[PDB]
PDB file of all heavy atoms in Angstrom:
ATOM      1  N   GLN A  35     -16.512  11.564 -23.667  1.00 13.57           N
ATOM      2  CA  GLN A  35     -15.308  10.743 -23.468  1.00 13.57           C
ATOM      3  C   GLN A  35     -14.275  11.539 -22.674  1.00 13.57           C
ATOM      4  O   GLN A  35     -13.575  10.937 -21.855  1.00 13.57           O
ATOM      5  CB  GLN A  35     -14.777  10.294 -24.832  1.00 13.57           C
ATOM      6  CG  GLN A  35     -15.798   9.409 -25.517  1.00 13.57           C
ATOM      7  CD  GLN A  35     -15.176   8.603 -26.665  1.00 13.57           C
ATOM      8  OE1 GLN A  35     -15.444   7.456 -26.854  1.00 13.57           O
ATOM      9  NE2 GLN A  35     -14.425   9.369 -27.466  1.00 13.57           N
ATOM     10  N   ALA A  36     -14.160  12.801 -22.861  1.00 12.94           N
ATOM     11  CA  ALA A  36     -13.343  13.602 -21.999  1.00 12.94           C
ATOM     12  C   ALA A  36     -13.764  13.561 -20.549  1.00 12.94           C
ATOM     13  O   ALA A  36     -12.957  13.485 -19.698  1.00 12.94           O
ATOM     14  CB  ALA A  36     -13.297  15.063 -22.548  1.00 12.94           C
ATOM     15  N   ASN A  37     -15.105  13.669 -20.310  1.00 12.93           N
ATOM     16  CA  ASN A  37     -15.560  13.574 -18.930  1.00 12.93           C
ATOM     17  C   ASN A  37     -15.181  12.199 -18.318  1.00 12.93           C
ATOM     18  O   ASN A  37     -14.705  12.144 -17.161  1.00 12.93           O
ATOM     19  CB  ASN A  37     -17.044  13.837 -18.926  1.00 12.93           C
ATOM     20  CG  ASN A  37     -17.560  14.305 -17.631  1.00 12.93           C
ATOM     21  OD1 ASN A  37     -18.089  13.483 -16.805  1.00 12.93           O
ATOM     22  ND2 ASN A  37     -17.451  15.572 -17.368  1.00 12.93           N
ATOM     23  N   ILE A  38     -15.427  11.119 -19.023  1.00 10.39           N
ATOM     24  CA  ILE A  38     -15.173   9.797 -18.475  1.00 10.39           C
ATOM     25  C   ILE A  38     -13.745   9.552 -18.268  1.00 10.39           C
ATOM     26  O   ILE A  38     -13.250   8.880 -17.351  1.00 10.39           O
ATOM     27  CB  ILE A  38     -15.853   8.681 -19.299  1.00 10.39           C
ATOM     28  CG1 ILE A  38     -15.794   7.314 -18.526  1.00 10.39           C
ATOM     29  CG2 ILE A  38     -15.252   8.551 -20.627  1.00 10.39           C
ATOM     30  CD1 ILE A  38     -16.166   6.251 -19.365  1.00 10.39           C
ATOM     31  N   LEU A  39     -12.898  10.218 -19.185  1.00 11.71           N
ATOM     32  CA  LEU A  39     -11.401  10.148 -18.985  1.00 11.71           C
ATOM     33  C   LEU A  39     -10.981  10.862 -17.728  1.00 11.71           C
ATOM     34  O   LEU A  39     -10.083  10.439 -16.995  1.00 11.71           O
ATOM     35  CB  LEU A  39     -10.768  10.739 -20.227  1.00 11.71           C
ATOM     36  CG  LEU A  39     -10.549   9.767 -21.373  1.00 11.71           C
ATOM     37  CD1 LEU A  39      -9.455  10.312 -22.334  1.00 11.71           C
ATOM     38  CD2 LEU A  39     -10.130   8.364 -20.931  1.00 11.71           C
ATOM     39  N   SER A  40     -11.606  12.040 -17.449  1.00 13.89           N
ATOM     40  CA  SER A  40     -11.276  12.750 -16.196  1.00 13.89           C
ATOM     41  C   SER A  40     -11.669  11.824 -14.970  1.00 13.89           C
ATOM     42  O   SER A  40     -10.907  11.711 -13.978  1.00 13.89           O
ATOM     43  CB  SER A  40     -12.136  13.956 -16.136  1.00 13.89           C
ATOM     44  OG  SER A  40     -13.292  13.845 -15.376  1.00 13.89           O
ATOM     45  N   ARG A  41     -12.835  11.153 -15.054  1.00 15.11           N
ATOM     46  CA  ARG A  41     -13.156  10.283 -13.979  1.00 15.11           C
ATOM     47  C   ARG A  41     -12.204   9.149 -13.790  1.00 15.11           C
ATOM     48  O   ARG A  41     -11.831   8.731 -12.690  1.00 15.11           O
ATOM     49  CB  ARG A  41     -14.619   9.644 -14.224  1.00 15.11           C
ATOM     50  CG  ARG A  41     -14.947   8.658 -13.187  1.00 15.11           C
ATOM     51  CD  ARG A  41     -16.529   8.381 -13.092  1.00 15.11           C
ATOM     52  NE  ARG A  41     -16.996   7.658 -14.223  1.00 15.11           N
ATOM     53  CZ  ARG A  41     -17.603   8.117 -15.262  1.00 15.11           C
ATOM     54  NH1 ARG A  41     -17.673   9.520 -15.455  1.00 15.11           N
ATOM     55  NH2 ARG A  41     -18.081   7.368 -16.220  1.00 15.11           N
ATOM     56  N   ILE A  42     -11.701   8.545 -14.884  1.00 12.43           N
ATOM     57  CA  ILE A  42     -10.768   7.438 -14.762  1.00 12.43           C
ATOM     58  C   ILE A  42      -9.402   7.937 -14.260  1.00 12.43           C
ATOM     59  O   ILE A  42      -8.787   7.159 -13.521  1.00 12.43           O
ATOM     60  CB  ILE A  42     -10.566   6.764 -16.238  1.00 12.43           C
ATOM     61  CG1 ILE A  42     -10.344   5.249 -16.063  1.00 12.43           C
ATOM     62  CG2 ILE A  42      -9.497   7.460 -17.047  1.00 12.43           C
ATOM     63  CD1 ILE A  42     -10.586   4.545 -17.325  1.00 12.43           C
ATOM     64  N   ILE A  43      -8.988   9.066 -14.602  1.00 12.23           N
ATOM     65  CA  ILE A  43      -7.798   9.704 -14.001  1.00 12.23           C
ATOM     66  C   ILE A  43      -7.883   9.852 -12.521  1.00 12.23           C
ATOM     67  O   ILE A  43      -7.037   9.508 -11.759  1.00 12.23           O
ATOM     68  CB  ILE A  43      -7.406  11.029 -14.686  1.00 12.23           C
ATOM     69  CG1 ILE A  43      -7.268  10.838 -16.171  1.00 12.23           C
ATOM     70  CG2 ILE A  43      -6.189  11.585 -14.027  1.00 12.23           C
ATOM     71  CD1 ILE A  43      -6.414   9.665 -16.521  1.00 12.23           C
ATOM     72  N   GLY A  44      -9.019  10.373 -12.077  1.00 10.36           N
ATOM     73  CA  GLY A  44      -9.271  10.502 -10.599  1.00 10.36           C
ATOM     74  C   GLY A  44      -9.295   9.140  -9.977  1.00 10.36           C
ATOM     75  O   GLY A  44      -8.733   8.979  -8.847  1.00 10.36           O
ATOM     76  N   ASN A  45      -9.923   8.123 -10.590  1.00  8.48           N
ATOM     77  CA  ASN A  45      -9.955   6.763  -9.978  1.00  8.48           C
ATOM     78  C   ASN A  45      -8.585   6.170  -9.886  1.00  8.48           C
ATOM     79  O   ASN A  45      -8.183   5.494  -8.870  1.00  8.48           O
ATOM     80  CB  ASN A  45     -10.870   5.881 -10.782  1.00  8.48           C
ATOM     81  CG  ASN A  45     -11.486   4.804  -9.928  1.00  8.48           C
ATOM     82  OD1 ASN A  45     -11.335   3.638 -10.230  1.00  8.48           O
ATOM     83  ND2 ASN A  45     -12.137   5.152  -8.871  1.00  8.48           N
ATOM     84  N   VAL A  46      -7.697   6.360 -10.919  1.00 10.83           N
ATOM     85  CA  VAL A  46      -6.375   5.877 -10.851  1.00 10.83           C
ATOM     86  C   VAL A  46      -5.621   6.544  -9.773  1.00 10.83           C
ATOM     87  O   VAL A  46      -4.747   5.903  -9.055  1.00 10.83           O
ATOM     88  CB  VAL A  46      -5.684   6.024 -12.287  1.00 10.83           C
ATOM     89  CG1 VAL A  46      -4.239   5.873 -12.165  1.00 10.83           C
ATOM     90  CG2 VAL A  46      -6.280   5.118 -13.255  1.00 10.83           C
ATOM     91  N   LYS A  47      -5.866   7.880  -9.556  1.00  9.94           N
ATOM     92  CA  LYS A  47      -5.145   8.575  -8.496  1.00  9.94           C
ATOM     93  C   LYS A  47      -5.577   7.969  -7.118  1.00  9.94           C
ATOM     94  O   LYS A  47      -4.723   7.739  -6.225  1.00  9.94           O
ATOM     95  CB  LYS A  47      -5.556  10.067  -8.460  1.00  9.94           C
ATOM     96  CG  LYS A  47      -4.376  11.001  -8.428  1.00  9.94           C
ATOM     97  CD  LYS A  47      -4.874  12.421  -8.675  1.00  9.94           C
ATOM     98  CE  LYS A  47      -5.078  12.651 -10.203  1.00  9.94           C
ATOM     99  NZ  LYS A  47      -3.845  12.781 -11.018  1.00  9.94           N
ATOM    100  N   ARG A  48      -6.815   7.656  -6.965  1.00 11.58           N
ATOM    101  CA  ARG A  48      -7.308   7.056  -5.752  1.00 11.58           C
ATOM    102  C   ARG A  48      -6.581   5.719  -5.456  1.00 11.58           C
ATOM    103  O   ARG A  48      -6.222   5.319  -4.370  1.00 11.58           O
ATOM    104  CB  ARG A  48      -8.835   6.849  -5.658  1.00 11.58           C
ATOM    105  CG  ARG A  48      -9.553   8.182  -6.035  1.00 11.58           C
ATOM    106  CD  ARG A  48      -9.733   9.106  -4.883  1.00 11.58           C
ATOM    107  NE  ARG A  48      -9.641  10.529  -5.259  1.00 11.58           N
ATOM    108  CZ  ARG A  48      -8.438  11.145  -5.403  1.00 11.58           C
ATOM    109  NH1 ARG A  48      -7.276  10.577  -5.188  1.00 11.58           N
ATOM    110  NH2 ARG A  48      -8.468  12.471  -5.807  1.00 11.58           N
ATOM    111  N   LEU A  49      -6.561   4.869  -6.548  1.00  9.60           N
ATOM    112  CA  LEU A  49      -5.824   3.602  -6.508  1.00  9.60           C
ATOM    113  C   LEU A  49      -4.401   3.742  -6.087  1.00  9.60           C
ATOM    114  O   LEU A  49      -3.941   2.939  -5.249  1.00  9.60           O
ATOM    115  CB  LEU A  49      -5.939   2.927  -7.909  1.00  9.60           C
ATOM    116  CG  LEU A  49      -5.703   1.413  -7.864  1.00  9.60           C
ATOM    117  CD1 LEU A  49      -6.661   0.687  -6.875  1.00  9.60           C
ATOM    118  CD2 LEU A  49      -5.952   0.843  -9.297  1.00  9.60           C
ATOM    119  N   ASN A  50      -3.709   4.754  -6.641  1.00  9.53           N
ATOM    120  CA  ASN A  50      -2.296   4.989  -6.296  1.00  9.53           C
ATOM    121  C   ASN A  50      -2.199   5.338  -4.785  1.00  9.53           C
ATOM    122  O   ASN A  50      -1.347   4.857  -4.072  1.00  9.53           O
ATOM    123  CB  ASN A  50      -1.798   6.097  -7.097  1.00  9.53           C
ATOM    124  CG  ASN A  50      -1.795   5.821  -8.606  1.00  9.53           C
ATOM    125  OD1 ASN A  50      -2.086   4.649  -8.992  1.00  9.53           O
ATOM    126  ND2 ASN A  50      -1.376   6.751  -9.474  1.00  9.53           N
ATOM    127  N   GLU A  51      -3.124   6.198  -4.315  1.00  9.52           N
ATOM    128  CA  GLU A  51      -3.076   6.505  -2.894  1.00  9.52           C
ATOM    129  C   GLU A  51      -3.244   5.288  -2.007  1.00  9.52           C
ATOM    130  O   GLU A  51      -2.531   5.019  -1.040  1.00  9.52           O
ATOM    131  CB  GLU A  51      -4.201   7.541  -2.610  1.00  9.52           C
ATOM    132  CG  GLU A  51      -4.594   7.662  -1.099  1.00  9.52           C
ATOM    133  CD  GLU A  51      -6.029   8.025  -0.823  1.00  9.52           C
ATOM    134  OE1 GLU A  51      -6.584   8.693  -1.749  1.00  9.52           O
ATOM    135  OE2 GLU A  51      -6.638   7.707   0.180  1.00  9.52           O
ATOM    136  N   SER A  52      -4.204   4.422  -2.402  1.00 10.60           N
ATOM    137  CA  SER A  52      -4.523   3.231  -1.624  1.00 10.60           C
ATOM    138  C   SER A  52      -3.309   2.288  -1.547  1.00 10.60           C
ATOM    139  O   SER A  52      -2.914   1.682  -0.604  1.00 10.60           O
ATOM    140  CB  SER A  52      -5.777   2.484  -2.103  1.00 10.60           C
ATOM    141  OG  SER A  52      -5.545   2.145  -3.445  1.00 10.60           O
ATOM    142  N   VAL A  53      -2.725   2.131  -2.770  1.00  9.50           N
ATOM    143  CA  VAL A  53      -1.587   1.200  -2.889  1.00  9.50           C
ATOM    144  C   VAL A  53      -0.353   1.696  -2.088  1.00  9.50           C
ATOM    145  O   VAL A  53       0.424   1.005  -1.479  1.00  9.50           O
ATOM    146  CB  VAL A  53      -1.173   0.932  -4.329  1.00  9.50           C
ATOM    147  CG1 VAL A  53       0.158   0.205  -4.444  1.00  9.50           C
ATOM    148  CG2 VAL A  53      -2.277   0.202  -5.027  1.00  9.50           C
ATOM    149  N   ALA A  54      -0.123   3.075  -2.100  1.00  9.14           N
ATOM    150  CA  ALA A  54       0.879   3.609  -1.260  1.00  9.14           C
ATOM    151  C   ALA A  54       0.701   3.376   0.178  1.00  9.14           C
ATOM    152  O   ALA A  54       1.649   3.018   0.924  1.00  9.14           O
ATOM    153  CB  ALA A  54       1.012   5.130  -1.596  1.00  9.14           C
ATOM    154  N   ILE A  55      -0.528   3.541   0.660  1.00 11.91           N
ATOM    155  CA  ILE A  55      -0.756   3.252   2.080  1.00 11.91           C
ATOM    156  C   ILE A  55      -0.521   1.760   2.361  1.00 11.91           C
ATOM    157  O   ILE A  55      -0.059   1.381   3.426  1.00 11.91           O
ATOM    158  CB  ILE A  55      -2.154   3.766   2.560  1.00 11.91           C
ATOM    159  CG1 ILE A  55      -2.433   5.153   1.953  1.00 11.91           C
ATOM    160  CG2 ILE A  55      -2.313   3.725   4.071  1.00 11.91           C
ATOM    161  CD1 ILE A  55      -1.460   6.190   2.380  1.00 11.91           C
ATOM    162  N   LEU A  56      -1.016   0.957   1.440  1.00  8.86           N
ATOM    163  CA  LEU A  56      -0.766  -0.506   1.673  1.00  8.86           C
ATOM    164  C   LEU A  56       0.737  -0.806   1.800  1.00  8.86           C
ATOM    165  O   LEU A  56       1.123  -1.608   2.616  1.00  8.86           O
ATOM    166  CB  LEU A  56      -1.442  -1.266   0.513  1.00  8.86           C
ATOM    167  CG  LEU A  56      -1.157  -2.791   0.336  1.00  8.86           C
ATOM    168  CD1 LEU A  56      -2.447  -3.493  -0.255  1.00  8.86           C
ATOM    169  CD2 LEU A  56       0.001  -3.012  -0.571  1.00  8.86           C
ATOM    170  N   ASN A  57       1.560  -0.222   0.928  1.00 10.41           N
ATOM    171  CA  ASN A  57       2.998  -0.428   0.998  1.00 10.41           C
ATOM    172  C   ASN A  57       3.499   0.001   2.334  1.00 10.41           C
ATOM    173  O   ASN A  57       4.369  -0.675   2.911  1.00 10.41           O
ATOM    174  CB  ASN A  57       3.770   0.294  -0.167  1.00 10.41           C
ATOM    175  CG  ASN A  57       3.352  -0.364  -1.486  1.00 10.41           C
ATOM    176  OD1 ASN A  57       2.615  -1.256  -1.646  1.00 10.41           O
ATOM    177  ND2 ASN A  57       3.936   0.213  -2.578  1.00 10.41           N
ATOM    178  N   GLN A  58       3.040   1.168   2.777  1.00  6.96           N
ATOM    179  CA  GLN A  58       3.479   1.720   4.080  1.00  6.96           C
ATOM    180  C   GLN A  58       3.157   0.720   5.216  1.00  6.96           C
ATOM    181  O   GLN A  58       4.008   0.426   6.097  1.00  6.96           O
ATOM    182  CB  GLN A  58       2.923   3.082   4.369  1.00  6.96           C
ATOM    183  CG  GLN A  58       3.431   4.083   3.478  1.00  6.96           C
ATOM    184  CD  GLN A  58       4.863   4.441   3.757  1.00  6.96           C
ATOM    185  OE1 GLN A  58       5.417   4.198   4.808  1.00  6.96           O
ATOM    186  NE2 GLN A  58       5.593   5.155   2.857  1.00  6.96           N
ATOM    187  N   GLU A  59       1.939   0.198   5.174  1.00  9.44           N
ATOM    188  CA  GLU A  59       1.548  -0.750   6.214  1.00  9.44           C
ATOM    189  C   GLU A  59       2.371  -2.031   6.169  1.00  9.44           C
ATOM    190  O   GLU A  59       2.788  -2.497   7.218  1.00  9.44           O
ATOM    191  CB  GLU A  59       0.076  -1.116   6.002  1.00  9.44           C
ATOM    192  CG  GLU A  59      -0.692  -1.479   7.312  1.00  9.44           C
ATOM    193  CD  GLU A  59      -0.413  -0.699   8.557  1.00  9.44           C
ATOM    194  OE1 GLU A  59       0.281   0.359   8.520  1.00  9.44           O
ATOM    195  OE2 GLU A  59      -0.700  -1.232   9.713  1.00  9.44           O
ATOM    196  N   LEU A  60       2.676  -2.545   4.952  1.00  6.60           N
ATOM    197  CA  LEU A  60       3.467  -3.756   4.844  1.00  6.60           C
ATOM    198  C   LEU A  60       4.885  -3.518   5.358  1.00  6.60           C
ATOM    199  O   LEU A  60       5.456  -4.347   6.033  1.00  6.60           O
ATOM    200  CB  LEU A  60       3.551  -4.184   3.351  1.00  6.60           C
ATOM    201  CG  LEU A  60       2.232  -4.927   2.893  1.00  6.60           C
ATOM    202  CD1 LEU A  60       2.400  -5.261   1.397  1.00  6.60           C
ATOM    203  CD2 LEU A  60       1.945  -6.184   3.711  1.00  6.60           C
ATOM    204  N   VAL A  61       5.490  -2.352   5.023  1.00  8.31           N
ATOM    205  CA  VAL A  61       6.792  -2.038   5.517  1.00  8.31           C
ATOM    206  C   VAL A  61       6.830  -2.069   7.064  1.00  8.31           C
ATOM    207  O   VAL A  61       7.688  -2.606   7.688  1.00  8.31           O
ATOM    208  CB  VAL A  61       7.290  -0.715   4.871  1.00  8.31           C
ATOM    209  CG1 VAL A  61       8.453  -0.238   5.696  1.00  8.31           C
ATOM    210  CG2 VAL A  61       7.693  -0.912   3.475  1.00  8.31           C
ATOM    211  N   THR A  62       5.862  -1.338   7.623  1.00  9.70           N
ATOM    212  CA  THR A  62       5.760  -1.194   9.105  1.00  9.70           C
ATOM    213  C   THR A  62       5.622  -2.642   9.732  1.00  9.70           C
ATOM    214  O   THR A  62       6.274  -2.932  10.747  1.00  9.70           O
ATOM    215  CB  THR A  62       4.616  -0.369   9.481  1.00  9.70           C
ATOM    216  OG1 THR A  62       4.535   0.781   8.760  1.00  9.70           O
ATOM    217  CG2 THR A  62       4.718   0.069  10.929  1.00  9.70           C
ATOM    218  N   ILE A  63       4.747  -3.462   9.122  1.00 11.73           N
ATOM    219  CA  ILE A  63       4.524  -4.760   9.752  1.00 11.73           C
ATOM    220  C   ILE A  63       5.709  -5.680   9.685  1.00 11.73           C
ATOM    221  O   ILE A  63       6.045  -6.350  10.576  1.00 11.73           O
ATOM    222  CB  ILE A  63       3.261  -5.468   9.160  1.00 11.73           C
ATOM    223  CG1 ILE A  63       2.733  -6.558  10.007  1.00 11.73           C
ATOM    224  CG2 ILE A  63       3.453  -5.965   7.794  1.00 11.73           C
ATOM    225  CD1 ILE A  63       1.635  -7.385   9.444  1.00 11.73           C
ATOM    226  N   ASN A  64       6.439  -5.613   8.543  1.00 10.19           N
ATOM    227  CA  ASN A  64       7.680  -6.416   8.457  1.00 10.19           C
ATOM    228  C   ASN A  64       8.738  -5.948   9.403  1.00 10.19           C
ATOM    229  O   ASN A  64       9.424  -6.695  10.053  1.00 10.19           O
ATOM    230  CB  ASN A  64       8.203  -6.372   7.020  1.00 10.19           C
ATOM    231  CG  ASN A  64       7.449  -7.279   6.068  1.00 10.19           C
ATOM    232  OD1 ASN A  64       6.819  -8.280   6.535  1.00 10.19           O
ATOM    233  ND2 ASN A  64       7.452  -6.957   4.772  1.00 10.19           N
ATOM    234  N   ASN A  65       8.857  -4.607   9.574  1.00 10.46           N
ATOM    235  CA  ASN A  65       9.892  -4.097  10.445  1.00 10.46           C
ATOM    236  C   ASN A  65       9.620  -4.422  11.925  1.00 10.46           C
ATOM    237  O   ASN A  65      10.496  -4.761  12.667  1.00 10.46           O
ATOM    238  CB  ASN A  65       9.920  -2.555  10.336  1.00 10.46           C
ATOM    239  CG  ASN A  65      10.506  -2.166   8.945  1.00 10.46           C
ATOM    240  OD1 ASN A  65      11.092  -2.894   8.216  1.00 10.46           O
ATOM    241  ND2 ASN A  65      10.356  -0.839   8.599  1.00 10.46           N
ATOM    242  N   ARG A  66       8.290  -4.421  12.276  1.00 10.46           N
ATOM    243  CA  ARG A  66       7.968  -4.803  13.636  1.00 10.46           C
ATOM    244  C   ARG A  66       8.146  -6.305  13.776  1.00 10.46           C
ATOM    245  O   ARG A  66       8.400  -6.819  14.861  1.00 10.46           O
ATOM    246  CB  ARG A  66       6.542  -4.359  14.008  1.00 10.46           C
ATOM    247  CG  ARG A  66       5.445  -5.366  13.667  1.00 10.46           C
ATOM    248  CD  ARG A  66       4.263  -5.123  14.536  1.00 10.46           C
ATOM    249  NE  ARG A  66       4.091  -3.683  14.914  1.00 10.46           N
ATOM    250  CZ  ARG A  66       3.261  -2.819  14.250  1.00 10.46           C
ATOM    251  NH1 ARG A  66       2.442  -3.308  13.229  1.00 10.46           N
ATOM    252  NH2 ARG A  66       3.171  -1.603  14.574  1.00 10.46           N
ATOM    253  N   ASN A  67       7.846  -7.083  12.773  1.00  8.82           N
ATOM    254  CA  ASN A  67       7.873  -8.597  12.876  1.00  8.82           C
ATOM    255  C   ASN A  67       9.362  -9.101  12.846  1.00  8.82           C
ATOM    256  O   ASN A  67       9.455 -10.335  13.187  1.00  8.82           O
ATOM    257  CB  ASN A  67       7.079  -9.179  11.736  1.00  8.82           C
ATOM    258  CG  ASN A  67       5.588  -9.364  12.031  1.00  8.82           C
ATOM    259  OD1 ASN A  67       5.148  -8.985  13.181  1.00  8.82           O
ATOM    260  ND2 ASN A  67       4.832  -9.696  11.085  1.00  8.82           N
ATOM    261  N   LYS A  68      10.313  -8.277  12.458  1.00 11.80           N
ATOM    262  CA  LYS A  68      11.688  -8.791  12.411  1.00 11.80           C
ATOM    263  C   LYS A  68      12.141  -9.569  13.632  1.00 11.80           C
ATOM    264  O   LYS A  68      13.057 -10.468  13.500  1.00 11.80           O
ATOM    265  CB  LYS A  68      12.626  -7.587  12.205  1.00 11.80           C
ATOM    266  CG  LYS A  68      12.724  -7.071  10.776  1.00 11.80           C
ATOM    267  CD  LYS A  68      14.002  -6.261  10.581  1.00 11.80           C
ATOM    268  CE  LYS A  68      14.124  -5.159  11.646  1.00 11.80           C
ATOM    269  NZ  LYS A  68      12.816  -4.452  11.919  1.00 11.80           N
ATOM    270  N   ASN A  69      11.550  -9.432  14.798  1.00 13.59           N
ATOM    271  CA  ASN A  69      11.929 -10.128  15.993  1.00 13.59           C
ATOM    272  C   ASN A  69      11.629 -11.664  15.871  1.00 13.59           C
ATOM    273  O   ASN A  69      12.175 -12.506  16.519  1.00 13.59           O
ATOM    274  CB  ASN A  69      11.337  -9.539  17.234  1.00 13.59           C
ATOM    275  CG  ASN A  69      11.805  -8.137  17.533  1.00 13.59           C
ATOM    276  OD1 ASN A  69      12.642  -7.670  16.767  1.00 13.59           O
ATOM    277  ND2 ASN A  69      11.289  -7.501  18.616  1.00 13.59           N
ATOM    278  N   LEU A  70      10.591 -11.978  15.105  1.00 12.68           N
ATOM    279  CA  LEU A  70      10.113 -13.336  15.065  1.00 12.68           C
ATOM    280  C   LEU A  70      11.035 -14.225  14.248  1.00 12.68           C
ATOM    281  O   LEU A  70      11.152 -15.427  14.595  1.00 12.68           O
ATOM    282  CB  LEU A  70       8.680 -13.398  14.348  1.00 12.68           C
ATOM    283  CG  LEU A  70       7.559 -13.451  15.412  1.00 12.68           C
ATOM    284  CD1 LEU A  70       7.737 -12.338  16.443  1.00 12.68           C
ATOM    285  CD2 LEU A  70       6.243 -13.326  14.716  1.00 12.68           C
ATOM    286  N   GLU A  71      11.764 -13.687  13.345  1.00 14.79           N
ATOM    287  CA  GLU A  71      12.855 -14.491  12.729  1.00 14.79           C
ATOM    288  C   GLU A  71      13.928 -14.823  13.779  1.00 14.79           C
ATOM    289  O   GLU A  71      14.389 -15.995  13.835  1.00 14.79           O
ATOM    290  CB  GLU A  71      13.569 -13.649  11.565  1.00 14.79           C
ATOM    291  CG  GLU A  71      12.650 -13.163  10.511  1.00 14.79           C
ATOM    292  CD  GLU A  71      11.849 -11.968  10.882  1.00 14.79           C
ATOM    293  OE1 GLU A  71      11.329 -11.915  11.993  1.00 14.79           O
ATOM    294  OE2 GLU A  71      11.724 -11.047  10.017  1.00 14.79           O
ATOM    295  N   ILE A  72      14.224 -13.932  14.695  1.00 15.09           N
ATOM    296  CA  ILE A  72      15.216 -14.217  15.782  1.00 15.09           C
ATOM    297  C   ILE A  72      14.588 -15.389  16.658  1.00 15.09           C
ATOM    298  O   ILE A  72      15.316 -16.300  16.952  1.00 15.09           O
ATOM    299  CB  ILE A  72      15.470 -12.960  16.638  1.00 15.09           C
ATOM    300  CG1 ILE A  72      15.918 -11.851  15.709  1.00 15.09           C
ATOM    301  CG2 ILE A  72      16.494 -13.293  17.627  1.00 15.09           C
ATOM    302  CD1 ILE A  72      16.979 -12.248  14.723  1.00 15.09           C
ATOM    303  N   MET A  73      13.374 -15.180  17.042  1.00 16.10           N
ATOM    304  CA  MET A  73      12.704 -16.186  17.982  1.00 16.10           C
ATOM    305  C   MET A  73      12.702 -17.573  17.275  1.00 16.10           C
ATOM    306  O   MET A  73      13.051 -18.576  17.932  1.00 16.10           O
ATOM    307  CB  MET A  73      11.370 -15.786  18.387  1.00 16.10           C
ATOM    308  CG  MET A  73      11.384 -14.688  19.505  1.00 16.10           C
ATOM    309  SD  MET A  73      11.896 -15.176  21.133  1.00 16.10           S
ATOM    310  CE  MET A  73      11.528 -17.013  21.169  1.00 16.10           C
ATOM    311  N   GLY A  74      12.252 -17.643  16.025  1.00 13.76           N
ATOM    312  CA  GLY A  74      12.219 -18.909  15.440  1.00 13.76           C
ATOM    313  C   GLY A  74      13.621 -19.500  15.122  1.00 13.76           C
ATOM    314  O   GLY A  74      13.767 -20.755  15.244  1.00 13.76           O
ATOM    315  N   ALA A  75      14.564 -18.697  14.819  1.00 16.80           N
ATOM    316  CA  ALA A  75      15.915 -19.190  14.599  1.00 16.80           C
ATOM    317  C   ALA A  75      16.470 -19.869  15.974  1.00 16.80           C
ATOM    318  O   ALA A  75      17.022 -20.917  15.902  1.00 16.80           O
ATOM    319  CB  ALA A  75      16.846 -18.084  14.173  1.00 16.80           C
ATOM    320  N   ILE A  76      16.205 -19.196  17.064  1.00 20.13           N
ATOM    321  CA  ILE A  76      16.779 -19.709  18.304  1.00 20.13           C
ATOM    322  C   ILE A  76      16.012 -20.932  18.663  1.00 20.13           C
ATOM    323  O   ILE A  76      16.548 -21.961  19.197  1.00 20.13           O
ATOM    324  CB  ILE A  76      16.837 -18.622  19.427  1.00 20.13           C
ATOM    325  CG1 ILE A  76      15.498 -18.504  20.081  1.00 20.13           C
ATOM    326  CG2 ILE A  76      17.410 -17.338  18.942  1.00 20.13           C
ATOM    327  CD1 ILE A  76      15.482 -17.603  21.289  1.00 20.13           C
TER     328      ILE A  76
END
């Protein structure tokens, strides 16, 4: 159970890494897309 707990901790760490990169990508895409609100408004 200690071994499988170590595995689960590692897996949670990997999940955290993936979610952080996902958040970075979403922030970048929104920041770049900000011009489309302007275009649609006009």
Side-chain angles (χ1 to χ4, degrees):
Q35 297 194 135
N37 202 263
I38 188 189
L39 276 199
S40 98
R41 177 159 72 265
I42 212 164
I43 300 316
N45 207 237
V46 168
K47 230 169 287 281
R48 311 277 143 275
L49 199 53
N50 298 355
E51 161 208 336
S52 63
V53 169
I55 316 302
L56 172 145
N57 293 1
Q58 289 293 339
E59 209 38 17
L60 285 176
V61 163
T62 316
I63 195 188
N64 282 337
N65 293 345
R66 91 153 35 96
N67 276 353
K68 280 199 307 318
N69 295 0
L70 261 53
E71 305 78 315
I72 305 317
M73 281 292 334
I76 83 170

